[PDB]
Structure 1
Amino acid sequence: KIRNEDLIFNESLGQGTFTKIFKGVRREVGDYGQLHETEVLLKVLDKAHRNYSESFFEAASMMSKLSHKHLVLNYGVCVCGDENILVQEFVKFGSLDTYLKKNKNCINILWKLEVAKQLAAAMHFLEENTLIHGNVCAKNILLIREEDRKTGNPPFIKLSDPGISITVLPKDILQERIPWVPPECIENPKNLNLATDKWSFGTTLWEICSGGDKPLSALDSQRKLQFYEDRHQLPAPKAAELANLINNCMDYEPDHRPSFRAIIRDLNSL
């Protein structure tokens, strides 16, 4: 819980679902009483959508009861003014979807495998804690550190918070989030379960293999609906080394989707 007076808003970085995102600075007393001015990620709920404030905050709160090297750090909230603001660590290299687009001509199978293994590790941690994320996608993966072939250092990613839950979002927004949202949640958003994240994880691997293309982007909401109704799978990406794993995770039967331990074992065997 942070004071408005300790936060300075700077440039807009974009928007999420019913939110606006800004780079910012938090003035804080840190360890040993040292004063720090810390770059922060600020997510502001749209005032016009103040109805979603509880879910907006339950999303960040749920994940911050657990600590983990691959889960993004949340500093707190500022409920100052009429604004609802999430204060989050600022990651140097932004989200994975934009990173994959701007760097497509420099991302090989080894880089992808390390990113997929780290994301599976985070999801395995969540599965063991029976915590549903609900919005696994490339936009919610943050790149802390780039790969450095010189020092052999692999990339390092974190999973960000899910945003407002699909269990309260309007149906046309859910439909636009096909194929990250699983078919059982399109049928009924309250079908959100651990198996939800395995499907979305599969969709996210497709993103990682497709240079930041969005799967099914050419299809409007009604065609996305019918895609599920006809039980189609995503096309294999040209870089097809993860296609079987993608299809295994994107199983129309939720009970058949493999555990993240089995997913990690599959990744390790490639």
Structure 2
Amino acid sequence: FHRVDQKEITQLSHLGQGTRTNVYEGRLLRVVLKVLDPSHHDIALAFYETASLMSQVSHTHLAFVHGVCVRGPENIMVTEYVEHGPLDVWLRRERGHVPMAWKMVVAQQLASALSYLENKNLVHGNVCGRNILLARLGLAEGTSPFIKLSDPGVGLGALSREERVERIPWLAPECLPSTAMDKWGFGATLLEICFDGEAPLSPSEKEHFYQRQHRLPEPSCPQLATLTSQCLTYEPTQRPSFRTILRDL
């Protein structure tokens, strides 16, 4: 990844929080600055691995990483500013007013981005609505939405059990104690999209759900029902490839 100097970045309004990060609007060009918390070197390394991965990839439905600013105890990931922000926040504002054809486009754009990663044997590890950003809302007639999948943030391997339980239902069950984990994440993300930004699923309740090997609900739309059932299986090897998912969509 590219190194950014603090002289090149301006930090503005706080947009939200990520895992171990505070997300701010900023300037470099309008950017999004992901400020890592004062961390251990493992978390800093996991954050760098994410800047590296996202700097070596290029896809229309993958948000851009400008680089990393590393000065003293601060680690700032300089990323692409996407107009309408997180998908879940949007779907929740527009509940009951989001057409099924709109949801279908977002699914296909998300699956093409994920098929690209799959072909390069690269893992995202954090596919959820929050990490799906809306470039274009596709609200006017003859316009489609345009999504860009965000960086996965601090890589999953560096996270505590407590933080992995918080990622349920998007976290693949095998990760509670592979490019197959993005198939679960994708499946749980179709459900969230279908339930208008509302996720299917307290910490103990969520852990017990996975431990008891219970399955997530069926989507509100029947079109995605077979797909979600195939994606949200506890056997990682049985999940379809995004090549198949993209064809089937």
Shorter-normalised TM range? over 0.9
**3-state SS in 2 of match to 1:99:** helix
CA contact (8 A) 2:83 2:135 kept: yes
Quick one: distance in 2 between partners of 1:244 and 1:229? Answer: 24
User: Relative to structure 1, is the Cα distance of residues 265 and 51 closer, same or farther in structure 2, using a 3 angstrom cutoff?
Assistant: closer
Distance in 2, Cα, partners of 1:256 & 1:236: 18
Shift of 1:227: 1.1
Measured in 2, the distance between the counterparts of 1:6 and 1:115 equals: 34
1:240-259 alignment, distance < 5 Å: 240-259=222-241
Match of 2:186 in 1: 201
Of 112, 115, 119, 2:103 maps to 112
Greater Cα shift, 13-22 or 43-52: 43-52
The aligned residue for residue 23 of structure 1 is 25
Aligned-pair distance for 1:48? 4.8
Q: What's the offset of the Cα at 1:264? A: 1.3
In structure 2, stretches of 5+ residues that fail to align are: none
CA deviation after TM superposition for structure 1 residue 148, in Å:
4.2
> How big is the shift at 1:81?
4.4
Unaligned stretches of 5+ in structure 1?
Answer: 27-37, 188-192
State the TM-score, normalizing by the size of structure 1.
Answer: 0.87
Find the counterpart in structure 2 of residue 14 from structure 1. Answer: 16
Instruction: Quote the Cα distance in structure 2 between the aligned partners of 1:64 and 1:210.
Output: 33
Matched, 1:173 2:173: no
Aligned partners of 1:49 and 1:103: how far apart in 2? Answer: 40
In structure 2, relative to structure 1, the CA distance for the partners of 1:93 and 1:49 (3 Å cut) is farther
Aligned 8 A contact 1:22 1:42 in 2: yes
1:133 aligns with 2:124: yes
The range that moved more, 109-118 or 62-71, is 62-71
User: How many residues matched?
Assistant: 247
Match of 2:207 in 1: 225
Which residue of 2 is the match for residue 31 of structure 1? none
Query: Contact 2:54/2:64 (CA < 8 Å) preserved in 1?
Result: no
Question: Over residues 78-128 of structure 1, what are the superposed CA-to-partner deviations in whole Å (9 max), with x where a residue is unaligned?
Answer: 113431100011010001111111122321110000000000000100000
SS, match of residue 231 in structure 1:
coil
Identity in percent: 47
Q: 1:63 aligns with which of 54, 77, 81?
A: 54
| Structure 2 letter corresponding to 1:171 | R
Equivalence map 1:19-168=2 (5 Å): 19-26=21-28, 38-48=29-39, 51-150=42-141, 152-168=142-158
C-alpha deviation, 1:52, in angstroms: 1.0
Distance in 1 (CA, whole Å) between partners of 2:204 and 2:72 is 40
Worse overlay, 131-140 or 223-232: 223-232
1:199-220 CA-to-partner distances (Å, cap 9, x unmatched) read 111001011111111221xxx2
Q: Is the 8 A contact 1:78 1:87 kept in 2?
A: yes
Q: Considering only aligned residues, what root-mean-square deviation do their CA atoms show, in Å?
A: 1.5
Q: Is the 8 A contact 1:77 1:87 kept in 2?
A: yes
Q: Residues 27-75 of structure 1: CA distance to partner in whole angstroms, max 9, x if unpaired?
A: xxxxxxxxxxx11100000115565111012112112201111111111
1:161 counterpart letter in structure 2: D
Letter in 2 for 1:24: G
CA contact (8 A) 2:46 2:157 kept: no
Partner of 1:34: none
Query: Is the contact between residue 206 and residue 243 of structure 1 (CA under 8 Å) also seen in structure 2?
Result: no
